[PDB]
Amino acid sequence: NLQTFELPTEVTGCAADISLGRALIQAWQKDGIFQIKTDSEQDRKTQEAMAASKQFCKEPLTFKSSCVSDLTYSGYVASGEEVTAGKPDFPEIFTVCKDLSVGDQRVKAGWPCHGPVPWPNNTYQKSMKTFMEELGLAGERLLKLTALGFELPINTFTDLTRDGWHHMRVLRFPPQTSTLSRGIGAHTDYGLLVIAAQDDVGGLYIRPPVEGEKRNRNWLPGESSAGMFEHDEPWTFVTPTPGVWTVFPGDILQFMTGGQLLSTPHKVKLNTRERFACAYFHEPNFEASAYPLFEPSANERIHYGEHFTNMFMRCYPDRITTQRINKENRLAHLEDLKKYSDTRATGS
Ligand SMILES: N=C(N)NOCC[C@H](N)C(=O)O
Ligand SMILES: O=C(O)CCC(=O)C(=O)O
Ligand SMILES: [Mn+2]
């Protein structure tokens, strides 16, 4: 039985906010996840996004597959196209990253992963953008509360999320039709927070913290978390519950907290019916470097955009986006922009 919290609309640092942050941390440390109650507008926007997803997925495959870009990873992923731990995953997905036109300087400069969302239509665009703006408000509340719970300055995490690389995976899992029940293999997500919504069908499992269990640092190429613990208990079923979003930490929170919080491993099983879900990623700015909060002498850093780019290249080795990154050596640009960017997102 997960804990469910109502968040205040604004987080100011009062005693109630600090107390709530303590409780959020404790729930992550015990269960790996908690639920936040949605209000009528949060719920309406969730349901409108789910409905737009259902209508898009009914479109012909050739049309859905045309919603792709060789500049951004935004757009369609066919069932069986994504790889997790060397094995295909079976949802169809529409990924929404920051929507930047070719008029944006970062796109003109050829920054990896920067480009315009290949929206299927302008009603889908509006529904997803409205939903993601509401999700972002919740992400910022959660980050202020988490800072307060760790006795950190309230803006510790939000200072990294200005123009943050927030993105969302809009998912449809097919019903199980073969002997394979794997929807998505075990993995961890990459940023600060994951805020997710699901329909009534069910299929998400999460792994709580386990005393003494070593957790891979998925930001390191030699410690991918993909596939880890896939067939080992414990796995907690996330029971579909009306009127909530779930929240769990991503890789950046594990790193910054030195493992006081863990990036929650999770996986999806196919069910007897198709299943719609949306997973939202509240992320640092592409140019931000995460750092250990509790070890100021530690020199390790995570360049968030580098982590995102590495992850999406491993997910989609043959996608046109990945091919163009390799063909234009855009990973080298990524090293260049670390030192010669003009955006002012970081540095003097
Ligand atoms: N893309 C995200 N956030 N999740 O998808 C599943 C994990 C991904 N294929 C991986 O190998 O990490
Ligand atoms: O299907 C879900 O509920 C979550 C999916 C997920 O974790 C992801 O797409 O990364
Ligand atoms: Mn995930």
Author numbering: 3 to 350
Article passage:
The ethylene-forming enzyme (EFE) is an Fe(II), 2-oxoglutarate (2OG), and l-arginine (l-Arg)-dependent oxygenase that either forms ethylene and three CO2/bicarbonate from 2OG or couples the decarboxylation of 2OG to C5 hydroxylation of l-Arg. l-Arg binds with C5 toward the metal center, causing 2OG to change from monodentate to chelate metal interaction and OD1 to OD2 switch of D191 metal coordination. The best characterized EFE is that from the Pseudomonas savastanoi (formerly Pseudomonas syringae) pv phaseolicola strain PK2, for which several crystal structures have been reported. This enzyme binds mononuclear Fe(II) using three side chains (H189, D191, and H268) with three water molecules completing the six-coordinate geometry. Here, we extend our understanding of EFE catalysis by carrying out biochemical, structural, and computational studies of the enzyme in complex with a substrate analogue and using two enzyme variants. In combination, the results presented here are compatible with the currently proposed enzyme mechanism,4−8 emphasize the necessity for OD2 of D191 to coordinate the metal, and highlight the importance of the second coordination sphere and longer range interactions in promoting EFE activity.
First, we consider the binding of l-canavanine, a chemical analogue of l-Arg in which the C5 methylene group is replaced by an oxygen atom. The EFE cannot transform this analogue into guanidine and P5C, but we also showed that the l-canavanine-bound enzyme fails to induce ethylene generation. To understand this lack of reactivity, we used anaerobic ultraviolet–visible (UV–vis) spectroscopy to examine the effect of l-canavanine on the metal-to-ligand charge-transfer (MLCT) transitions of EFE·Fe(II)·2OG and determined the structure of the EFE·Mn(II)·2OG·l-canavanine complex. l-Canavanine binds to the EFE with its O5 atom pointing away from the metal center, whereas C5 of l-Arg points toward the iron atom, consistent with the ability of the enzyme to react with only the latter compound. Anaerobic UV–vis spectroscopy of EFE·Fe(II)·2OG·l-canavanine and structural studies of EFE·Mn(II)·2OG·l-canavanine confirm that binding of the substrate analogue leads to bidentate coordination of 2OG to Fe(II). Critical insights into why the l-canavanine-bound enzyme is ineffective for ethylene generation were obtained from the crystal structure of EFE·Mn(II)·2OG·l-canavanine that revealed that OD1 of D191 coordinated the metal instead of the catalytically productive OD2 coordination noted for bound l-Arg. The ineffective l-Arg analogue l-canavanine binds to the EFE with O5 pointing away from the metal center while promoting chelate formation by 2OG but fails to switch the D191 metal coordination from OD1 to OD2. Congruent with the structural results, MD simulations predict that the most favored l-canavanine conformation in the EFE·Fe(III)·OO•–·2OG·l-canavanine complex has its O5 pointed away from the metal center and facing toward E84.
